[PDB]
Design a protein around this ligand. Structure first.
Ligand SMILES: CO[C@@H]1O[C@H](CNc2nc3cc4c(=O)[nH]c(N)nc4cc3[nH]2)[C@@H](O)[C@H]1O
Ligand SMILES: CO[C@@H]1O[C@H](CNc2nc3cc4c(=O)[nH]c(N)nc4cc3[nH]2)[C@@H](O)[C@H]1O
Ligand SMILES: [Cl-]
Ligand SMILES: [Cl-]
Ligand SMILES: [Zn+2]
Ligand SMILES: [Zn+2]
Lengths: 373, 373
């Protein structure tokens, strides 16, 4: 099997569909990655994650380096063996989560020193340490160590932040290439920064393309800017990236965010929304989200969604799941999560099929008209 | 399929093994019933409950009448359809749980009035209402409405309590027999009381046998008396019950409690221990229980138990489950629960096989020597 081979089978406008072939499996694009921060997709066995249609999951350098530890996972055989998922795993590099979750941080050209949110102990991240951690975990897609610029930012602060990220991108490339086993078996993605500014996004794309990566993420979005502004930035930013490599929009998003981002050339997505909001009682349907705890569902015998093919919708009613979530029962979290991840995967499948068949424009219009009715 | 047919295939001493045939399936005895108080065996899909080997699960009149409500469950098609378990369900009658969990109760010859532990609202239980609720739920094995005498009790207080329970047993019989669909499709078990007193246990057995039931439970135990005293009471109490009907020890118990109770003629068991203590980090093994959160398991690649055939032990290490439970991850609760229920079912299987093969005495000795080493 290839280390990493991306093939575009069809296009419609800026939208693309195809496959990434890797040693541990094929990734169909556009792809949605369920989030598995602490070496588990919350409330699902890996076999259930696979049954929903997921080809790849996301893990986190920041969380795993703190608990259970990167060296410990490596001693136990790597992340895949540890959690029982034998297909591709992409790991974020720590650059975003350290600044989001740490109580205290010190930032410099070398990297970031920080206090753990679990117990206050002191730790360090850098391009070299992030790549090493991802090696110890056995990631298949390694993310460069970057800085996610806060929003809003002045042009000059966005520029200096982006420039640091580009120096860190080169250090990430070099650290990855030095580790022969990692360079032979994994892939490395760079992360574009530049906040909402077209000229900075161009400078960042140029720097990443000069280094060369297997894929290119659009970083620095889903940080409070809202959909209109995110789409405006995507309109000019995605065309700056190499066309022949995958484009990954980090942390996005709601179903309509995904559809619009695909219309703008994005191939890969991750988001906690289906898992987290599932546990909180929000179920996705083709007619929009529903709050299953609402009293209107107490005697509703219909499945969560009338068309969904998932195992939850084949077997259990809204009324039962309403009861489980209101009672705080673990099975409620399990069933809501499986349905929401299955729904996300069915959305990605309809996106892939409609692009391949040259009817994605109509799909997006029909999707929105019904979802927002 | 028969409504209810018990057949004893083999005996060793006081121990028996056989089958109860019912419309919704066969129950192999001695049997362990996982507890599914709120219309779910906590953290398991019904298909997973079945995969562990369980033939029957337990539900609770008290919890279900409060949430989601008995009439609501009946409107939605009955408990089996609601939760997705199509095999036999035994429901406790409310007599124990109302006194265990209610904040305020009023007891009389008619029944028990009480305040719900969920919201304080006022409700009533009685022999007639308990049987009606169990009818609305669609229980397969209906328990008589009784009173679980507190421990310790004076002989005279135990006697007056037991006598009330025996009058309630006759009222339960009559209410059940009046409901033609219930009498045709379900079974009714009586509950022996009498605290720790041989003469009262005899009077209670005589009263229940005169009425006639499909099965006979030993009530009033697992109320703080300890194993030595529970076994002493079982020594004289079980032989008082009709030999040709199943004997059900309510709320028991730890693995050694089950083995000793089988040696004294018990055929059926239920207990929250495998589920509840599983979620808390206790795993059962043939070498005794372990606390998976203990630091000694942080890098242990062995399964929870070295012989167990369950899906958890085929796929995941102690080290991974240690991480999940310490992190508060739902998958930890799921995996611990599946293993513990599977372990309980494997214990029951070894008990059944050893009785059938006439080597149960040796099995009990070998079990204890290793479990308590
Ligand atoms: O909307 C909310 O926002 C969060 C996800 N948003 C997000 N933006 C990201 C940007 C980056 C980045 O620039 N760099 C690296 N390395 N990782 C990233 C990860 C990101 N995640 C969720 O809370 C979601 O609900
Ligand atoms: O040991 C602890 O004690 C609890 C279970 N013990 C228990 N004894 C019971 C007795 C009766 C009874 O007499 N009547 C009816 N109707 N139901 C019953 C249910 C019972 N459950 C758990 O907390 C266990 O950990
Ligand atoms: Cl999540
Ligand atoms: Cl439980
Ligand atoms: Zn579904
Ligand atoms: Zn096991």
């Amino acid at each position: 099997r290839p280390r990493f081979s991306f093939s575009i089978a069809a296009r419609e406008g800026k939208a693309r569909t195809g496959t990434i072939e890797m040693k541990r499996g094929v990734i169909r694009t556009p792809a949605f990655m369920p989030v598995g921060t602490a070496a588990t997709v919350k409330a699902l066995k890996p076999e259930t994650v696979r049954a929903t249609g997921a080809d790849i999951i996301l893990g986190n350098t920041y969380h795993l380096m703190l608990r259970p530890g990167a060296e410990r996972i490596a001693k136990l055989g790597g992340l895949h063996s540890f959690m029982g998922w034998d297909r591709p795993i992409l790991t974020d590099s720590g650059g975003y989560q350290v600044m989001s979750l740490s109580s205290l941080t010190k930032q410099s050209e070398e990297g970031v020193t920080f206090k753990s949110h679990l117990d206050g102990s002191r730790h360090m991240l850098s391009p070299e340490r992030s790549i090493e951690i991802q090696h110890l975990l056995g990631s298949d897609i390694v993310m460069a160590f970057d800085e996610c610029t806060p929003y809003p930012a002045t042009p000059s602060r966005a520029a200096s932040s982006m420039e640091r990220s580009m120096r860190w991108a080169k250090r990430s490339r070099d650290a990855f290439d030095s580790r022969k086993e990692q360079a032979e078996n994994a892939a490395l993605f760079g992360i574009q920064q530049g906040s909402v500014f077209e000229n900075l996004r161009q400078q960042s794309a140029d720097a990443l393309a000069e280094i060369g990566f297997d894929g290119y993420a659009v970083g620095g979005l889903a940080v409070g800017e809202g959909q209109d502004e995110m789409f405006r930035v995507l309109d000019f930013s995605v065309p700056m990236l190499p066309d022949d490599k995958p484009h990954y929009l980090m942390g996005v998003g709601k179903p309509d965010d995904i559809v619009g981002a695909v219309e703008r050339g994005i191939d890969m997505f991750d988001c906690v929304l289906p898992t987290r909001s599932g546990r909180n009682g929000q179920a996705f349907t083709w007619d929009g989200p529903i709050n299953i705890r609402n009293a209107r569902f107490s005697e509703d015998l219909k499945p969560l969604d009338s068309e969904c093919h998932c195992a939850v919708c084949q077997k259990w009613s809204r009324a039962y799941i309403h009861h489980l979530i209101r009672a705080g029962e673990i099975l409620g979290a399990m069933l809501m999560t499986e349905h929401n991840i299955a729904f996300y995967q069915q959305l990605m499948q309809k996106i892939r099929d409609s692009i391949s068949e040259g009817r994605f424009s109509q799909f997006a219009q029909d999707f929105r008209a019904r979802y927002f009715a």
